[PDB]
Amino acid sequence: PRYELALILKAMQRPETAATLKRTIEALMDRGAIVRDLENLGERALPYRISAHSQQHNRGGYFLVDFYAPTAAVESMVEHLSRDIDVIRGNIVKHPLTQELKECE
Amino acid sequence: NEDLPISMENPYKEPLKKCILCGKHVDYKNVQLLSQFVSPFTGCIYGRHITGLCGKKQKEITKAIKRAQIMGFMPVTYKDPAYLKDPKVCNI
Amino acid sequence: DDPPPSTLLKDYQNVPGIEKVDDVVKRLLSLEMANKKEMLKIKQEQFMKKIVANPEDTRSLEARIIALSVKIRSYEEHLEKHRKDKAHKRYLLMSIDQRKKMLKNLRNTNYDVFEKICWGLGIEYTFPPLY
Amino acid sequence: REVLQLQEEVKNFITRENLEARVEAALDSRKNYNWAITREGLVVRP
RNA sequence: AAAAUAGACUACGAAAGUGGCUUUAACAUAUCUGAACACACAAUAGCUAAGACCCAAACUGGGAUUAGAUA
Numbered sequence: 001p002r003y004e005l006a007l008i009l010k011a012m013q014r015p016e017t018a019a020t021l022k023r024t025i026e027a028l029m030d031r032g033a034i035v036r037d038l039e040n041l042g043e044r045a046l047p048y049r050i051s052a053h054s055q056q057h058n059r060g061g062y063f064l065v066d067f068y069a070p071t072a073a074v075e076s077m078v079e080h081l082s083r084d085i086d087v088i089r090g091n092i093v094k095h096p097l098t099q100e101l102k103e104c105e
Numbered sequence: 106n107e108d109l110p111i112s113m114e115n116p117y118k119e120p121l122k123k124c125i126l127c128g129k130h131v132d133y134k135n136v137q138l139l140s141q142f143v144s145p146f147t148g149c150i151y152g153r154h155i156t157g158l159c160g161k162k163q164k165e166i167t168k169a170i171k172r173a174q175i176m177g178f179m180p181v182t183y184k185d186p187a188y189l190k191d192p193k194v195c196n197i
Numbered sequence: 198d199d200p201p202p203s204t205l206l207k208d209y210q211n212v213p214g215i216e217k218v219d220d221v222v223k224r225l226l227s228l229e230m231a232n233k234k235e236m237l238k239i240k241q242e243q244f245m246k247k248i249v250a251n252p253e254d255t256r257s258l259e260a261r262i263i264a265l266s267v268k269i270r271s272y273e274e275h276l277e278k279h280r281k282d283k284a285h286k287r288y289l290l291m292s293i294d295q296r297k298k299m300l301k302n303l304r305n306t307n308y309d310v311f312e313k314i315c316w317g318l319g320i321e322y323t324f325p326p327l328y
Numbered sequence: 329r330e331v332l333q334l335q336e337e338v339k340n341f342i343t344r345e346n347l348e349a350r351v352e353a354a355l356d357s358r359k360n361y362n363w364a365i366t367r368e369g370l371v372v373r374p
Numbered sequence: 375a376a377a378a379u380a381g382a383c384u385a386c387g388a389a390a391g392u393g394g395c396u397u398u399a400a401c402a403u404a405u406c407u408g409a410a411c412a413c414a415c416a417a418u419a420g421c422u423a424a425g426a427c428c429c430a431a432a433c434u435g436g437g438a439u440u441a442g443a444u445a
């Protein structure tokens with residue numbers, strides 16, 4: 001179905017951020033995804049200190065990757081995000097736009 | 106005789122008031138809107154007696170707040186200071 | 198056997214011009230990128246074409262039997278993985294019971310359709326124990 | 329209508345060809361999903 | 375490990391029960407009554423085997439206390 005990957009990447013210089021974005025999108029396409037858009041929400045201070053890969057982070061870059069993936073892909077992608085060292089936190093959700101507005105009148 | 110009363114629903118009934126968020130999409134990434142429903146000093150979520158939302162949108166706001174908190178978009182123990190000056194929509 | 202992953206969804210199969218379309222949109226509109234419920238709908242549609250006389254009439258007893266049969270197949274596939282799911286165990290056992298009830302009613306009312314159903318879905322009708 | 333909308337949308341998807349260019353363009357752009365609501369139920373754009 | 379706010383809500387589940395987030399499966403049935411004996415569950419006692427043991431703790435020891443100590 002349609003998924004959104006909310007990605008919190010390590011506060012890095014532009015070449016390395018580009019490399020990590022290319023790597024993660026390549027993984028998405030390798031697991032059978034069709035990536036639709038890539039949006040940068042910006043670099044910002046984390047709401048709280050996050051410990052990942054034996055390193056404490058207080059700042060991070062926020063990105064959104066919209067895509068369509070086969071259902072079995074999601075779990076695999078999660079594992080891959082668990083191994084990539086430049087990702088503080090990746091979460092895959094069903095895309096909010098698919099959930100259609102309820103008729104509360 | 107035309108003057109007899111006719112059967113109808115009570116016309117003098119005020120149509121049910123719509124909550125401020127009715128017809129609007131509540132997204133976990135919209136931290137500004139979600140911060141308009143937490144305590145500035147503790148970060149606790151307000152109830153419908155304070156927010157005034159219909160229970161369905163209350164549930165949406167609750168789930169969105171937890172999703173944002175666990176996905177690293179929103180602080181949990183306090184309201185983000187950047188959003189302390191947004192319009193106050195809570196009756197507290 | 199399941200439908201091929203390349204088969205279009207039930208709702209995107211009669212739309213005009215679906216054969217003049219790019220490969221990517223075909224993938225987006227296929228069973229490869231949908232949850233299991235569309236695949237079950239496709240199975241149901243195939244069985245309705247293969248068995249019943251009027252595939253569009255869904256309120257008939259044969260249609261209900263086919264629907265319950267695809268649901269039962271789904272429950273068995275689910276329980277093959279979640280061996281300790283007692284709720285879905287209950288649902289499977291119940292669904293088998295009501296399919297037996299529907300088969301009994303169909304046998305008592307329409308024997309030709311009963312034979313066609315039993316052949317098409319591979320159902321072996323068995324008479325209940327006396328004690 | 330859904331199919332035609334997808335006909336037009338699938339053109340602007342991130343393929344493996346325009347991957348790097350779109351990555352750089354995303355790094356050169358910022359999007360904002362924050363808006364505020366008033367007691368009058370009006371969206372206050374940031 | 376177990377889930378403060380929401381919850382002034384009363385929804386889901388056959389019942390017991392379920393209230394941290396994401397994803398995947400997924401929530402029988404178009405009349406009703408009908409089981410000790412059929413199939414699934416569920417709870418309540420009491421013992422039996424092995425296992426863990428932070429913490430608490432009937433029993434069992436030890437210390438302090440009136441003038442049969444504080445049960």
Ligand code: FES
Nearest residue numbers: 104105127128159
């Ligand atoms: S009446 Fe519109 S959200 Fe409840």
Ligand SMILES: [Mg+2]
Nearest residue numbers: 406407408409
């Ligand atoms: Mg009965």
Ligand SMILES: [Mg+2]
Nearest residue numbers: 428429430431
């Ligand atoms: Mg002890």
